[PDB]
Amino acid sequence: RPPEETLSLWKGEQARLKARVVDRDTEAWQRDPSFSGLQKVGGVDVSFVKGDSVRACASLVVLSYPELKVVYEDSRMVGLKAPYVSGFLAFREVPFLVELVQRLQEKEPDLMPQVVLVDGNGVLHQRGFGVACHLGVLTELPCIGVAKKLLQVDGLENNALHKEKIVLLQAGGDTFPLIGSSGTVLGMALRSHDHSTKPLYVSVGHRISLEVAVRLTHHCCRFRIPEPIRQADIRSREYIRRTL
Amino acid sequence: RPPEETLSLWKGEQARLKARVVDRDTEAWQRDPSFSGLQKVGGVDVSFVKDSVRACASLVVLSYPELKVVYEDSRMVGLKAPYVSGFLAFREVPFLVELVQRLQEKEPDLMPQVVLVDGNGVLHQRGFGVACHLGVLTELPCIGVAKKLLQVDGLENNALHKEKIVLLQAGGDTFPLIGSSGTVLGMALRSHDHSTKPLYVSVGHRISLEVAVRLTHHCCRFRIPEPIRQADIRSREYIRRTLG
RNA sequence: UAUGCAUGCAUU
RNA sequence: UAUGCAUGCAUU
Ligand SMILES: [Mn+2]
Ligand SMILES: [Mn+2]
Ligand SMILES: [Mn+2]
Ligand SMILES: [Mn+2]
Ligand SMILES: [Mn+2]
Ligand SMILES: [Mn+2]
Ligand SMILES: [Mn+2]
Ligand SMILES: [Mn+2]
Ligand SMILES: [Mn+2]
Ligand SMILES: [Mn+2]
Ligand SMILES: [Mn+2]
């Protein structure tokens, strides 16, 4: 665990950058009934080596929409600087994702994604500023947080009531809202596919509304994990595997 | 692949040893409705290090009917011959025989009354698969259990075969594998109610096919019978506990 | 045999 | 995040 000085610096940085988050739609395709104008959807992920605390592999992919085919992949081995601490995920993974976005601008600027799906929460976060917000503010790209487990903050809990609501999700696209003790809607549970029971937890990262974020996440789901995140996960793990 | 002159020598050896296979019951517990008298069921497997020489050969003995492991011998070995379909014994069997001999020296009262082998017996290009080969070299009763169909003597995994598999509806259901010669070479077996891919069971030595199938079914907590499953799990764990 | 993917359970 | 197991499909 990092020293308190590091964690203090981290909390202060999250509070500083949180003032820049935009939690409403700012792109014309977002207000379109079929997302007309949306052509490129990004996904990011970092995979790790079981033996090694230093080496990781970061991946950025860009997919065509609505076809969901990979038109760009950049995967690179990186040197880890921070350990994993819940609530501070960005300080472990986000510096490498920002660099991949910058490399894309240098290499294939016409494939810059119009929105990025991030493997982690956005505003559903201990301090309202998860990795998806953090990437969005540092890149100014619209970003969606997609998490596979419920971050138990603001009274949210994976209890019997929560599991009851999960059973009530019956088809792909069904949802229920994640309400905090303050009464605010932090995100949505989403049944991403007809043949999956475990929901995704979707929240706003940056420059998108929750309703649009949920609907786009659903439209990217060939399987349970949305295809951009899924392809970034698959390809970064393949890189680690082929270099053992 | 070994040269054809080598494979021809191996075929000749398989033909000579086949004269020693006994494909009927020779143990009093075998004809018993509940296998009363059966206390010890063996299982063998060889796992490999993803390096072509090093492997881990495992012998387990399980109590019956509780299916609890009362003996495990997992041994790193230097494997020499490559896998050639129809010649599996020339890769794995010398090391399995050595494990049985080690058991006799170490815990002779735990010698198994029957061994389940991860591979075919008489269901085989020349009617003499690895399970027959282990049985004849140890004189132990042996059952061959394969996880996919060896396509010999007109047997094929075609649509007709797949339709018969769909007719297997409950755990214990079987259908016979009839060769073009008119012989019943083995049985397809549905291991349990929640599995659809069958096991392919055949006589190794000193057991009838009907008894071999019924005992295989009694060892199935999951799709793979518990003696083979434990040998597979524990030999893989042994490899990880060193190299993995 | 080893690996990949899908779906779920557990551990972390 | 990584690992184990379960069930299926695929490559070999
Ligand atoms: Mn379009
Ligand atoms: Mn991730
Ligand atoms: Mn991942
Ligand atoms: Mn690759
Ligand atoms: Mn008994
Ligand atoms: Mn095997
Ligand atoms: Mn095995
Ligand atoms: Mn295996
Ligand atoms: Mn999984
Ligand atoms: Mn993972
Ligand atoms: Mn499997």
Side-chain angles (χ1 to χ4, degrees), chain B residues 148 192 194-197 223 229 236:
Chain B
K148 43 189 178 199
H192 63 85
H194 298 294
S195 170
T196 57
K197 184 183 175 67
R223 173 174 181 256
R229 184 179 169 260
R236 283 190 293 102

Side-chain angles (χ1 to χ4, degrees), chain B residues 163-176:
Chain B
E163 269 189 11
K164 289 165 156 72
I165 290 173
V166 98
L167 292 180
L168 305 173
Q169 299 227 35
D173 290 343
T174 58
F175 63 84

Side-chain angles (χ1 to χ4, degrees), chain A residues 80-93:
Chain A
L80 291 167
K81 289 165 198 67
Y84 172 70
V85 190
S86 182
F88 299 103
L89 178 57
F91 297 92
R92 175 165 174 83
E93 304 194 347

